[PDB]
Amino acid sequence: GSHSWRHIRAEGLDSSYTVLFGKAEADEIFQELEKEVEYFTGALARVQVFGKWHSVPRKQATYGDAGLTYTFSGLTLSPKPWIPVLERIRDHVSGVTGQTFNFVLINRYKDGSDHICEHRDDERELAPGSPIASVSFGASRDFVFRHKDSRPSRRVAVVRLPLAHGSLLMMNHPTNTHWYHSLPVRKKVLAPRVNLTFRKILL
DNA sequence: CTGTCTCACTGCG
DNA sequence: TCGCAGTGAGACA
Ligand SMILES: O=C(O)CCC(=O)C(=O)O
Numbered sequence: 658g659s660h661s662w663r664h665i666r667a668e669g670l671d672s673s674y675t676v677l678f679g680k681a682e683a684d685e686i687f688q689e690l691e692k693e694v695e696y697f698t699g700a701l702a703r704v705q706v707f708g709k710w711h712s713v714p715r716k717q718a719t720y721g722d723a724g725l726t727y728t729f730s731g732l733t734l735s736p737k738p739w740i741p742v743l744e745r746i747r748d749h750v751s752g753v754t755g756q757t758f759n760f761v762l763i764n765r766y767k768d769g770s771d772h773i774c775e776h777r778d779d780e781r782e783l784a785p786g787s788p789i790a791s792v793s794f795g796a797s798r799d800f801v802f803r804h805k806d807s808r809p810s811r812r813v814a815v816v817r818l819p820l821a822h823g824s825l826l827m828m829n830h831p832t833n834t835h836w837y838h839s840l841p842v843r844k845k846v847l848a849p850r851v852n853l854t855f856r857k858i859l860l
Numbered sequence: 861c862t863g864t865c866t867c868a869c870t871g872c873g
Numbered sequence: 874t875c876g877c878a879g880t881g882a883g884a885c886a
Pocket residue numbers: 762764773778791793800820838839840852853854
């Protein structure tokens with residue numbers, strides 16, 4: 658291991674942040690991701706929330722071992738077979754953390770108008786206690802942690818941090834039980850961002 | 861006086 | 874421009 662982590666801690670919050678790649682390498686990986694990743698469209702890009710169906714305000718893709726599935730918000734996604742650039746990132750993350758992953762959800766935000774609404778990654782197909790590894794390329798975007806009982810008896814402070822080009826954010830147990838997260842709209846950001854959340858899914 | 865939950869939106873302020 | 878409130882159409886437990 659031996660890595661410079663920034664620990665994000667609060668009640669029920671255990672997250673870690675480090676920069677894995679310098680600019681030249683991260684640029685190279687980003688350009689490969691832009692060339693190689695295939696995103697879902699049409700019916701595989703619509704979610705149901707609060708009884709309404711929506712096209713997702715971004716693009717999504719999934720890769721991982723054969724036989725696995727991932728379902729959230731009325732949407733079931735099937736993994737495409739691994740490709741070199743994603744295996745490079747998975748293996749690097751695995752070496753630095755000691756954790757293994759069999760699945761990745763890729764989110765692409767074309768600019769600051771693309772975003773993701775607040776949620777917990779608490780799905781049943783997720784291995785109990787398993788961490789989620791979030792790797793980011795392209796534009797730096799703000800990421801928000803919010804405590805679930807602040808929306809509002811327990812006015813617990815929100816946690817904000819920018820996720821930089823080439824960075825890794827580890828979300829350990831029980832972060833996803835007690836805290837919601839989101840990438841809010843940032844109208845000033847004009848460049849695209851590609852995010853990878855490596856997960857461990859049960860068969 | 862009092863059920864829990866929501867990866868999304870519009871309508872505010 | 875950003876953040877918050879209330880969803881809304883049910884499915885739960
Ligand atoms: O865009 C991000 O950095 C986070 C994406 C996310 O929340 C997820 O993959 O579940």
